[model samples]
Target: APTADQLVKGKNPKLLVLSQRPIVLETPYDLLVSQPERTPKEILYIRNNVDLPGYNTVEGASLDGWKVEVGGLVDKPFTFEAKELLELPQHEVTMVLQCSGNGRSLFQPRTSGNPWKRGGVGNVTFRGVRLKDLLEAKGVKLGEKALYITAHASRQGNAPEFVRSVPIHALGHALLALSMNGEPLPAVHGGPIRLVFPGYFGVNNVKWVQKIEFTEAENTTAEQMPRYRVPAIPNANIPFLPQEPGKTYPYSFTNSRPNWLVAINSFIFAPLEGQTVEGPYVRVEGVAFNDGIVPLVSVEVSANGGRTWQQARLERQEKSFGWVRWQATLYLRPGEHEVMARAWDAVGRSQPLDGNIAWNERGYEYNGVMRVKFTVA
Candidate 1:
């Protein structure tokens, strides 16, 4: 059979998988977010097989014999046994992982990578051993100003091997995530073990990870070399810029710039949107998520075509590896109308309150705060 497209819709055994085409969540309500149903355009972006095994379903992979290597600039190079690794202090963080291609489908004439529309990203809490503790235990002693750590996983040659490295500057506080979404990460989701990088790209989240090697030289993978690099400033979608034809970028956290990544943002729940309502109690609700920044200020909704807005109540996360849910109730009535939402980070980086075209490249951070419209009886 011909190879599948670079991107395709995900399948969940629990629910009928939707096709790769974008989907609009109707009134049934997305049990996952706890808010009203959302849209595929509104769903978080998720990129699969980014330098990782696309479908890791190995069984009985013993954790006891599993070990991770720490070397380079370290006084004591060592292999950490799973049991010993657990002895080190672990930290838990709730983070959002997104493929820079979360909005790739929006690119005219299509783009190179996953054709993910939206809904390609999501927020998930993770629990794992702090990279710092692991490094200190082994005694890092590199003389270079920067470090690169590679996570290696064992896999067959036919599979998309999961291997990735992070800038040493960024790994000191990284997580060897062992749990996700407040539960074990499904095997398909890189379970048993994975790397969870907050405020980072989905490509950085390596799954079924087997090893980590520290090095002074930068990582230069075919995927990261030229294909994924973004230009210094926003311009037309010249993906793989500065690289000659037929070259793709090596995967890395190249989106280090502030605007390179997305901030808190949201979109409306569909079907319930409308112009006017006669009831005294009208409820407006939607789903919101950030790329794992902090201090969620609030999610506000607008009824009068955005002239006035009311705050939506956010539900605290029940597990560390999940998302915070938000909802709001208000009165509505009359003709044409619009409803929307915006999230605020503790750092004051709310969605860009400006209206401009998408960055134009394949990556669309359409977090300009989303809106939907409908009429009420």
Candidate 2:
């Protein structure tokens, strides 16, 4: 395993390395908000569940031999070559790519995965052919039992195959993405072809998609079960792990739901946390986004905690799936000040006031109001 510093060396020095082997990386706050909208690949976060493929090697660098097999519960099963698929009509979508455990570190009881702060999310455009079009072109029709669509990717060694399944309804916005941000998709970011599930968690957008299967039920693999799951009952009291070392506790997954739809969330990007500013007026800027189920209504910022808040101007976004950049100027006296941001969607749902309210054993989907402290010199 490489150290965080060593892992990002020669790659993205500005990115925050969370893990080595699987190569989980997070964008820094400054880099995350550098651009008004799109996130550059260099600063975009990477979340790999298994060992990375030999993307840099000659054998893996090209998509010449890449093919995705579509089968199982389909009237017609066919394998489409990457080149052939690229010739079809292309579609583009801009959406938030956020890891399910993006705010795991904010959990009080702690979680058992990469501790990601708020930077594990990015907004970018993906260009590819509609998955439904591909299926229809191949004369494929979902069978009566086909309730879920599973993605299978190339695996390394004996590790779990990184297979993931989502409800068939997700096909509405799914795409076999070939490029990102107007450029050929980088091999590290799932070149050749990756499943793009707009408005869904990053895990659902399986990388290096090699096979597509229509299943009768959701995937039962470990990656789909105890992992990437949250309590089905809202505000459920999940127990804390015991202090005994090497002891495994039995966790019930009977009433848990897969980490799917993203919660409405926002983050402060300007005045970098703990930054010193000499000014009576400080520019406060950040981003707000949701699952695209509904349009965002407003983004409010509070310089003196939540006692008072002012609406921040939101940048125009063409697509509902994309995040909205917000900016607000706040006046403050010379001293220490804490700034907080919260967002609300059209459905009357807003972020929790505190992270504790959203805390879970797995620390998934921490969409609480974001607070940042800074110095006013």
Candidate 3:
């Protein structure tokens, strides 16, 4: 809703505007060098599902009264003002926020929604009170089978209520981030306050978060379950029907579960997408991340095309939620060379060599291997 320029101060000429509506902006992969460890707040990618009202509210406006409500299975429902939320025991997390559809454009059958590339992600430090801290203080206890938790965003539109859920087990890592990168959270990026659940896709970390509910089940009509869920079947290329928003090829009228894990993937961030180099040896670097459940053990670079692979040096890792920076030295003869990067997590899982599209209806999680072709003259 609110235009990109309206929600935040100053414009990022470096951002690649993926779409105009709902204002989706992606960070340039090369800009990754700006903050070697964490992305600058000004250049971080912005993803919005619905238009947020009062984005640029005047001073002393009612927007300051915005509150976050917690209920559902709690002994008693409770709400907190921004000031009150900050007063609670504070915590900070260094993590990556990636769009579930980060690599949607790479898919062949081409799914709907924002066609984002690898730039739809970044690493940052979030400061706020833990969701569990607030919930537990309010005497919120789990009821039997209360495995599902729902988050409600203060989104404006007929756009499916903008509700989503994560497993109850994720409560430990979730934070109600009030600031990003040591600065006040900007409105464009779910400012004033937002939920920061590291390791999960950005979609699950609801911005402008207003309410959270713990329940055995949420109303199935919510799009969070049906739209974001990755189908059990793979390589789906079915067209979506406008008549029914959530209805797709294989699945019928029923909501499943939201995608909860970040897929293993890596890409070359430097060398300019199509720039030519004249050096005998060039440096290669990018990032690799996985579900918060495991740590990335190694990152391999394919300097001689995909035929051969070499281990690249892994830089300092911030935490399990943050992506690891890897670099390698490569010597190239005068010719065209295609370099690719992929990573393996601690649990023996690695990125696919080919970016074979998993091809979900919503294009939820496309974690295929990333290859960048450059020339040497």
Candidate 4:
């Protein structure tokens, strides 16, 4: 039950509310595709694991006191005030910020957590100080054997602190984000400062960042372990495996891997579900993106299910991690029709035709071909 203020906290009214306590919000499909490139903060999706940080409160606007401490396997541990880090060399990275459970609602037999549709993702640019530059400036040197970098944030009450760890190798493009889309990072989104891990899932980009620790081993927090992980073996189909209904997968963490990279995915936005439009010519539009490891090759649109596909013209991508907007004009008869979209990356990897093939017990990555039904009158 979201309060009136909580419901409208720096978010568009059209956005769907998923939870009340932690305040999770999902972007509407139409709003998601409204901007061709960077998504505005008002329309960006929000996902929180714990209570809001102090900086999110009415009196927390001044981040003068907010500081992020860097420690653990560093030769010279350092702490910098929020404003201090903002003065450092600012770098911008435009990328897809998608929740691991972006399409959990589409999982067959259902899954736990928020029943998010494809709207649980957004493409936005973050302006921040590069973690590498920050460390270098502070004269902080990581131990040669340090393999993981874990981030911890402020939590409220007895709730679990939303701490997460990523491999040190993934920090090459990481940043301490201070702003989003040219605006100071909003409180609801991770005000003052947050960790931004490009090419990784939203969870891997820790919000309300307070401390970063370079460690020899990954953090073993519950949020790090069984929570945000996928099967080690690809195409395991954990959902359809022999298991009791309504029960979590019995797989051990030893055999699971963290959901790190963003899977190749695309979605239809123009001919929305249940939309009624003038017939004959329907302009199909949507967005597609991957983990930035490889470029997107093509995005195909199908007006008559999967019978045939037309390659949608992809807008030139300026940022490697940012999503590519694609559009195609489809000529159709005056009747009800279904339109679908799928994407392919440079490495020849495309979305799975069926989401079931990629389904996990937690329904993390649902990159199946997306379809929507609409009436053309």
Best-matching candidate per TM-score:
4
Clash total of candidate 2:
0
lDDT of each: 0.53, 0.79, 0.72, 0.80
Weakest lDDT window of 10 consecutive positions for candidate 1: 20-29
Question: Candidate 2 regions off by >4 Å?
Answer: 1-10, 56-60, 156-159, 234-253, 317-319
Candidate 3, 79: how far from true, in Å? 2.4
Q: After superposition, how far is residue 162 of candidate 3 from its true place, in Å?
A: 1.5
Per-residue lDDT value at 227 in model 3:
69
The positional error of residue 112 in candidate 4, measured at the CA in angstroms, is: 0.7
Report the lDDT tens digits of candidate 3 across residue range 1-377. Answer: 44444544554666777666567788766675566689876678877777576553211123377788887876678787877875689888888788888888787666788888777888889898998898777677766776767888885544436787787888878898888788777677777778877888888888778888887765464456466776552323321112222345545334233566677777677665677988888888887778768767788988766788888888864337887888988988988788888887777878655454366667767777777788888
Better of 1 and 2 by TM-score: 2
| Candidate structures ordered by TM-score, highest first | 4, 2, 3, 1
Position 294, candidate 1: lDDT: 55
Q: Name the candidate, 1 or 3, with the larger TM-score value.
A: 3
* Count of clashes, each model: 38, 0, 1, 0
The number of the candidate with the highest lDDT is 4
TM-score of 4: 0.89
TM-score of each: 0.70, 0.89, 0.86, 0.89
lDDT of 1 by residue, 168-243 (tens): 6556447887665455545545656776666666666676676676776545664444444453333334322232
